Amino acid sequence: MAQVLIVGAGMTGSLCAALLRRQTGPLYLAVWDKADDSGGRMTTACSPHNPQCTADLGAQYITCTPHYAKKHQRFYDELLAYGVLRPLSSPIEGMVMGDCNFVAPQGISSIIKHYLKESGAEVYFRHRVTQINLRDDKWEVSKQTGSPEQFDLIVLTMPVPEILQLQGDITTLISECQRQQLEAVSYSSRYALGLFYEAGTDVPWAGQYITSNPCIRFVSIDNKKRNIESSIGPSLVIHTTVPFGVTYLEHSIEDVQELVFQQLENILPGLPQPIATKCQKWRHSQVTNAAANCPGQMTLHHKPFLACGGDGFTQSNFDGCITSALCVLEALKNY
Numbered sequence: 001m002a003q004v005l006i007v008g009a010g011m012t013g014s015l016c017a018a019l020l021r022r023q024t025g026p027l028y029l030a031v032w033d034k035a036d037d038s039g040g041r042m043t044t045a046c047s048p049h050n051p052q053c054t055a056d057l058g059a060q061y062i063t064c065t066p067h068y069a070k071k072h073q074r075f076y077d078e079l080l081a082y083g084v085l086r087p088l089s090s091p092i093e094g095m096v097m098g099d100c101n102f103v104a105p106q107g108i109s110s111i112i113k114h115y116l117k118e119s120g121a122e123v124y125f126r127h128r129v130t131q132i133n134l135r136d137d138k139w140e141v142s143k144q145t146g147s148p149e150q151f152d153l154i155v156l157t158m159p160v161p162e163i164l165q166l167q168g169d170i171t172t173l174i175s176e177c178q179r180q181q182l183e184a185v186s187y188s189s190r191y192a193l194g195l196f197y198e199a200g201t202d203v204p205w206a207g208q209y210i211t212s213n214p215c216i217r218f219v220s221i222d223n224k225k226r227n228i229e230s231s232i233g234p235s236l237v238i239h240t241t242v243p244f245g246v247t248y249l250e251h252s253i254e255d256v257q258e259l260v261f262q263q264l265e266n267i268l269p270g271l272p273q274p275i276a277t278k279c280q281k282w283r284h285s286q287v288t289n290a291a292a293n294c295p296g297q298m299t300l301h302h303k304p305f306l307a308c309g310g311d312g313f314t315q316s317n318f319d320g321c322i323t324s325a326l327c328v329l330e331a332l333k334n335y
């Protein structure tokens with residue numbers, strides 16, 4: 001009977017959906033995302049030439065600190081039993097460490113896809129929430145196209161400035177103090193460049209952190225990082241710096257691509273011309289100085305229920321999303 005809407009098919013949202021399926025039903029689970037596919041900042045791009053040639057444009061690997069294991073032990077052991085995650089066994093230059101690194105052999109977006117199927121939720125793509133209105137002690141959720149929809153509960157997982165862009169009753173359900181806390185939330189900006197080959201080969205490492213370059217911050221050989229043996233072609237992922245990301249936010253994607261491509265020649269000369277390229281703009285890459293109080297979630301209405309979750313309330317990492325999802329679930333436990 002209960003109609004629950006989860007806005008955002010990212011890390012926080014897919015886990016909220018999977019956790020809601022447990023500890024209940026009966027309920028109807030809907031997941032809406034403005035993008036063509038799921039993942040959010042954990043997406044994996046695939047080559048047009050071959051769907052097997054894959055590159056992680058956002059998150060690279062899962063860093064497990066000795067605190068969040070055994071705190072999130074149940075989450076890690078489940079993702080390892082299914083083979084979704086596997087320990088990192090390839091070298092990555094410039095990394096700092098009793099930590100343990102993990103990689104997703106089928107691409108980092110496979111984690112979200114696993115949680116979405118576990119939830120049994122009805123997932124709808126190219127579904128951008130425009131307005132959230134209150135009609136007869138129930139929610140009326142509007143989209144870019146077409147007709148609006150009714151729900152009993154809503155969980156919002158998109159970056160904080162995007163929650164603030166929504167029009168309707170939501171703008172008046174947010175108290176002045178809550179609005180000030182949300183406005184304090186800040187994200188850095190970066191550009192991602194995915195390059196696809198069929199060539200092969202190289203360098204000894206699989207990943208490399210760069211601090212001396214004005215445009216590039218990190219370079220990864222995605223196939224070697226995930227340790228794909230098969231002879232599929234190599235895949236290169238480049239993460240820009242924050243100053244480059246902020247300077248070129250409103251610039252042409254084809255112009256930005258040429259800046260990073262000419263910068264890759266200085267870091268790594270002797271590479272063939274790529275078959276395919278994928279440039280991804282991360283306007284809200286990672287949470288810088290934002291909380292605003294440290295809490296996992298923010299409830300803005302109880303009957304009917306509405307909360308905001310995600311990165312902006314914890315930290316911009318896999319365990320931050322887990323803590324934010326667990327906090328949202330404890331908030332709706334008696335609803």
Ligand SMILES: Cc1cc2nc3c(=O)[nH]c(=O)nc-3n(C[C@H](O)[C@H](O)[C@H](O)COP(=O)(O)OP(=O)(O)OC[C@H]3O[C@@H](n4cnc5c(N)ncnc54)[C@H](O)[C@@H]3O)c2cc1C
Binds near residue numbers: 040282
């Ligand atoms: C370059 C980069 C490197 C990173 N590296 C790491 C790493 O190595 N390890 C690590 O742990 N983490 C890393 N992260 C961060 C990690 O990817 C995130 O912390 C995690 O993705 C947070 O997901 P989320 O669910 O909170 O939000 P998101 O993944 O942002 O999900 C929000 C979703 O909501 C959708 N959406 C937004 N508005 C609407 C709307 N109006 N209607 C419908 N849908 C909407 C968006 O399209 C998006 O899919 C990195 C991120 C970036 C950008």
